Write a protein that holds these residues in place. Structure first.
Motif, PDB file in Angstrom:
ATOM      1  N   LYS A  95      33.589   9.523  75.116  1.00 52.79           N
ATOM      2  CA  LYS A  95      32.568   8.650  75.978  1.00 52.79           C
ATOM      3  C   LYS A  95      32.917   7.433  76.279  1.00 52.79           C
ATOM      4  CE  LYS A  95      28.789   7.057  77.513  1.00 52.79           C
ATOM      5  NZ  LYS A  95      28.219   7.177  79.101  1.00 52.79           N
TER       6      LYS A  95
ATOM      7  N   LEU B  39      13.560  11.278  78.650  1.00 54.74           N
ATOM      8  CA  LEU B  39      13.628  10.549  80.127  1.00 54.74           C
ATOM      9  C   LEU B  39      13.849  11.641  81.136  1.00 54.74           C
ATOM     10  CD1 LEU B  39      14.369   8.224  82.011  1.00 54.74           C
ATOM     11  CD2 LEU B  39      16.665   8.574  81.296  1.00 54.74           C
ATOM     12  N   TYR B  49      21.966  11.073  88.255  1.00 59.95           N
ATOM     13  CA  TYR B  49      22.731  10.173  87.734  1.00 59.95           C
ATOM     14  C   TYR B  49      23.856  10.610  86.692  1.00 59.95           C
ATOM     15  CZ  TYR B  49      19.801   6.576  90.362  1.00 59.95           C
ATOM     16  OH  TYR B  49      19.177   6.016  91.420  1.00 59.95           O
ATOM     17  N   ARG B  52      28.108  14.239  85.372  1.00 59.36           N
ATOM     18  CA  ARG B  52      29.068  14.227  84.027  1.00 59.36           C
ATOM     19  C   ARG B  52      28.836  14.810  82.907  1.00 59.36           C
ATOM     20  NH1 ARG B  52      31.772  12.568  80.381  1.00 59.36           N
ATOM     21  NH2 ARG B  52      30.389  10.796  79.602  1.00 59.36           N
ATOM     22  N   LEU B  53      27.646  14.366  82.613  1.00 67.61           N
ATOM     23  CA  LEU B  53      27.152  15.210  81.313  1.00 67.61           C
ATOM     24  C   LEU B  53      27.007  16.702  81.159  1.00 67.61           C
ATOM     25  CD1 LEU B  53      24.636  12.519  79.952  1.00 67.61           C
ATOM     26  CD2 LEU B  53      27.252  12.755  80.053  1.00 67.61           C
ATOM     27  N   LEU B  72      24.427   4.823  73.612  1.00 66.71           N
ATOM     28  CA  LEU B  72      23.266   3.787  74.307  1.00 66.71           C
ATOM     29  C   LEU B  72      22.708   3.057  73.146  1.00 66.71           C
ATOM     30  CD1 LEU B  72      20.391   5.305  76.346  1.00 66.71           C
ATOM     31  CD2 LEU B  72      19.906   4.195  74.200  1.00 66.71           C
ATOM     32  N   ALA B  75      24.067  -0.448  72.415  1.00 67.45           N
ATOM     33  CA  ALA B  75      23.769  -1.526  73.354  1.00 67.45           C
ATOM     34  C   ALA B  75      22.466  -2.431  72.974  1.00 67.45           C
ATOM     35  CB  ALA B  75      23.506  -1.018  74.913  1.00 67.45           C
ATOM     36  N   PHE B  96      26.454  -5.963  80.228  1.00 70.84           N
ATOM     37  CA  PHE B  96      25.832  -5.037  80.272  1.00 70.84           C
ATOM     38  C   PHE B  96      25.414  -4.258  81.594  1.00 70.84           C
ATOM     39  CE2 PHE B  96      23.179  -1.338  78.653  1.00 70.84           C
ATOM     40  CZ  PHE B  96      22.212  -1.200  79.498  1.00 70.84           C
ATOM     41  N   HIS B 100      26.021  -0.713  85.558  1.00 70.07           N
ATOM     42  CA  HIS B 100      24.672  -0.188  85.970  1.00 70.07           C
ATOM     43  C   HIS B 100      24.733  -0.483  87.362  1.00 70.07           C
ATOM     44  CE1 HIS B 100      24.138   0.671  81.788  1.00 70.07           C
ATOM     45  NE2 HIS B 100      23.464   1.709  82.177  1.00 70.07           N
ATOM     46  N   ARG B 103      26.750   1.475  89.435  1.00 70.35           N
ATOM     47  CA  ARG B 103      26.258   2.712  89.733  1.00 70.35           C
ATOM     48  C   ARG B 103      25.000   2.745  90.594  1.00 70.35           C
ATOM     49  NH1 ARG B 103      27.024   2.580  83.849  1.00 70.35           N
ATOM     50  NH2 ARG B 103      28.893   3.772  83.504  1.00 70.35           N
ATOM     51  N   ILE B 105      21.925   1.238  90.224  1.00 71.32           N
ATOM     52  CA  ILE B 105      20.781   1.457  89.491  1.00 71.32           C
ATOM     53  C   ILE B 105      19.957   0.203  89.696  1.00 71.32           C
ATOM     54  CG2 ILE B 105      19.576   1.862  87.191  1.00 71.32           C
ATOM     55  CD1 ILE B 105      22.272   3.223  86.522  1.00 71.32           C
ATOM     56  N   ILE B 113      12.955   3.807  81.922  1.00 69.69           N
ATOM     57  CA  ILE B 113      13.202   4.024  80.424  1.00 69.69           C
ATOM     58  C   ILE B 113      12.003   3.691  79.504  1.00 69.69           C
ATOM     59  CG2 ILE B 113      14.082   1.726  79.830  1.00 69.69           C
ATOM     60  CD1 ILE B 113      15.270   5.289  78.652  1.00 69.69           C
TER      61      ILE B 113
HETATM   62  C1  HEM Z   1      17.412   0.816  77.636  1.00 71.40           C
HETATM   63  C2  HEM Z   1      18.137   1.849  78.434  1.00 71.40           C
HETATM   64  C3  HEM Z   1      19.630   1.925  78.421  1.00 71.40           C
HETATM   65  C4  HEM Z   1      20.726   1.508  77.805  1.00 71.40           C
HETATM   66  C5  HEM Z   1      20.555   0.670  76.420  1.00 71.40           C
HETATM   67  C6  HEM Z   1      21.782   1.912  78.353  1.00 71.40           C
HETATM   68  C7  HEM Z   1      23.038   2.153  77.845  1.00 71.40           C
HETATM   69  C8  HEM Z   1      24.383   2.490  78.344  1.00 71.40           C
HETATM   70  C9  HEM Z   1      25.337   2.421  77.591  1.00 71.40           C
HETATM   71  C10 HEM Z   1      25.947   1.680  76.613  1.00 71.40           C
HETATM   72  C11 HEM Z   1      26.384   2.913  78.654  1.00 71.40           C
HETATM   73  C12 HEM Z   1      27.884   2.986  78.568  1.00 71.40           C
HETATM   74  C13 HEM Z   1      28.531   2.070  79.060  1.00 71.40           C
HETATM   75  C14 HEM Z   1      28.604   2.098  80.544  1.00 71.40           C
HETATM   76  O1  HEM Z   1      29.172   2.720  81.216  1.00 71.40           O
HETATM   77  O2  HEM Z   1      27.821   1.068  80.912  1.00 71.40           O
HETATM   78  C15 HEM Z   1      25.534   3.732  79.706  1.00 71.40           C
HETATM   79  C16 HEM Z   1      26.293   4.375  80.736  1.00 71.40           C
HETATM   80  C17 HEM Z   1      25.306   4.863  81.633  1.00 71.40           C
HETATM   81  N1  HEM Z   1      24.014   4.490  81.937  1.00 71.40           N
HETATM   82 FE1  HEM Z   1      22.751   3.376  81.030  1.00 71.40          FE
HETATM   83  N2  HEM Z   1      21.594   2.684  79.454  1.00 71.40           N
HETATM   84  C18 HEM Z   1      20.134   2.801  79.797  1.00 71.40           C
HETATM   85  C19 HEM Z   1      19.207   3.194  80.519  1.00 71.40           C
HETATM   86  C20 HEM Z   1      19.989   3.826  81.948  1.00 71.40           C
HETATM   87  C21 HEM Z   1      19.057   4.405  82.823  1.00 71.40           C
HETATM   88  C22 HEM Z   1      17.851   4.445  82.918  1.00 71.40           C
HETATM   89  C23 HEM Z   1      19.970   5.139  83.662  1.00 71.40           C
HETATM   90  C24 HEM Z   1      19.686   5.594  84.890  1.00 71.40           C
HETATM   91  C25 HEM Z   1      18.581   6.360  85.369  1.00 71.40           C
HETATM   92  C26 HEM Z   1      21.228   4.918  83.285  1.00 71.40           C
HETATM   93  C27 HEM Z   1      22.416   5.421  83.771  1.00 71.40           C
HETATM   94  C28 HEM Z   1      23.641   5.139  83.093  1.00 71.40           C
HETATM   95  C29 HEM Z   1      24.935   6.150  83.447  1.00 71.40           C
HETATM   96  C30 HEM Z   1      25.139   7.017  84.581  1.00 71.40           C
HETATM   97  C31 HEM Z   1      25.855   5.815  82.712  1.00 71.40           C
HETATM   98  C32 HEM Z   1      27.259   6.850  82.414  1.00 71.40           C
HETATM   99  C33 HEM Z   1      26.928   7.913  81.659  1.00 71.40           C
HETATM  100  C34 HEM Z   1      28.299   8.978  81.652  1.00 71.40           C
HETATM  101  O3  HEM Z   1      28.613   9.465  82.569  1.00 71.40           O
HETATM  102  O4  HEM Z   1      28.865   8.874  80.664  1.00 71.40           O
HETATM  103  N3  HEM Z   1      21.215   3.840  82.179  1.00 71.40           N
HETATM  104  N4  HEM Z   1      24.208   3.074  79.624  1.00 71.40           N
END
Ligand code: HEM
Ligand code: HEM
Lengths: 145, 145
Positions: A95, B39, B49, B52-53, B72, B75, B96, B100, B103, B105, B113
């Motif tokens: 990841k 979610l 979004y 990839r998963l 996640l 973070a 952080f 995003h 992407r 977002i 969330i």
């Molecule tokens: C409190 C909520 C959230 C936390 C703490 C969080 C945390 C993270 C972390 C640590 C990563 C890995 C580093 C990075 O690529 O930025 C990540 C990736 C990502 N996040 Fe967030 N995120 C949150 C909510 C969201 C939401 C609501 C969305 C979209 C609706 C989102 C979409 C993504 C996507 C698409 C990735 C890449 C996933 C992959 O392909 O592996 N995130 N996020």
């Protein structure tokens, strides 16, 4: 493969990782920044990958560098926390590799972090035994790049 | 802007965040996966979004989803650890946000969330008082998007 490299984390290697991290992970901001500045000092060629961070020589005073440094330490924290379960360590490593692959960071390039780690460890009275243990962990990530 | 949102994090809000995290953060894999699957179930559109998963319906058994879910939680761990120094919290939150924003977002999208968090907290018996505290933390991130 990453699954083969993960099997190289023997009992004693995991123990040494935990023992050293206990001290090192105790100051994520301090040791994190030290780690990054040492990298930029010993391998100036890597600064190009961090253009977004700005003037990297400012160190602790550079908010973006500080933010990145702190964040980096949490990734290490995540690895250490997954040592008990090989399956979880692997999925966490792959990841983490995703974004580094996107930046075209190669295994050889990633391996340049071993120097900085060895030096930070030594500053805390942790010798070669520990540096070699961390190199093993870094090798798991390298197998995924 | 982010600094101003951080100002809403009062002594009582930070106290409730730390108390609830002490429990929620004790099982990062379990609660992390619970958050993601909740979610997806409450807002199916967000699955777009995460192509990839792969087959996210597999849940915990999906290595990529499990890998992302655990990550996640670290973070959030980072945010919780920086609560007493607004300067560090801010630089970590901005670091952080970078990926995003890339992407695409939006703040509104990220806000989705809040529902999952409220439900995960409730499963551990943390009422609205705690849900409101977490909504405030998410609001700091939203200010960065
Ligand atoms: C409190 C909520 C959230 C936390 C703490 C969080 C945390 C993270 C972390 C640590 C990563 C890995 C580093 C990075 O690529 O930025 C990540 C990736 C990502 N996040 Fe967030 N995120 C949150 C909510 C969201 C939401 C609501 C969305 C979209 C609706 C989102 C979409 C993504 C996507 C698409 C990735 C890449 C996933 C992959 O392909 O592996 N995130 N996020
Ligand atoms: C102990 C080793 C390392 C760790 C734990 C680490 C950790 C991280 C983390 C957690 C992020 C943020 C999430 C993401 O965007 O993927 C990141 C970003 C990044 N990493 Fe790594 N990394 C390491 C070594 C390296 C090395 C050796 C290079 C380059 C030679 C590299 C280049 C990058 C770059 C360019 C970014 C983006 C910085 C920014 O624009 O904010 N990383 N890394």
């Amino acid at each position: 493969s990453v699954y083969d490299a993960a099997a190289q984390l023997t009992a004693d290697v995991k123990k040494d990782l935990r023992d050293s991290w206990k001290v090192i992970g105790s100051d994520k901001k301090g040791n994190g920044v030290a780690l990054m500045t040492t990298l930029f000092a010993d391998n100036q060629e890597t600064i190009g990958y961090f253009k977004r961070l700005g003037d990297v020589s400012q160190g602790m005073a550079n908010d973006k560098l500080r933010g990145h440094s702190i964040t980096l330490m949490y990734a290490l924290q995540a690895f250490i926390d997954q040592l008990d379960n090989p399956d979880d360590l692997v999925c966490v490593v792959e990841k983490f590799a995703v974004n580094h692959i996107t930046r075209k960071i190669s295994a050889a390039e990633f391996g340049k972090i071993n120097g900085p780690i060895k030096k930070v460890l030594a500053s805390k009275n942790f010798g070669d035994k520990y540096a070699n243990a961390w190199a093993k962990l870094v090798a798991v990530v390298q197998a995924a790049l």
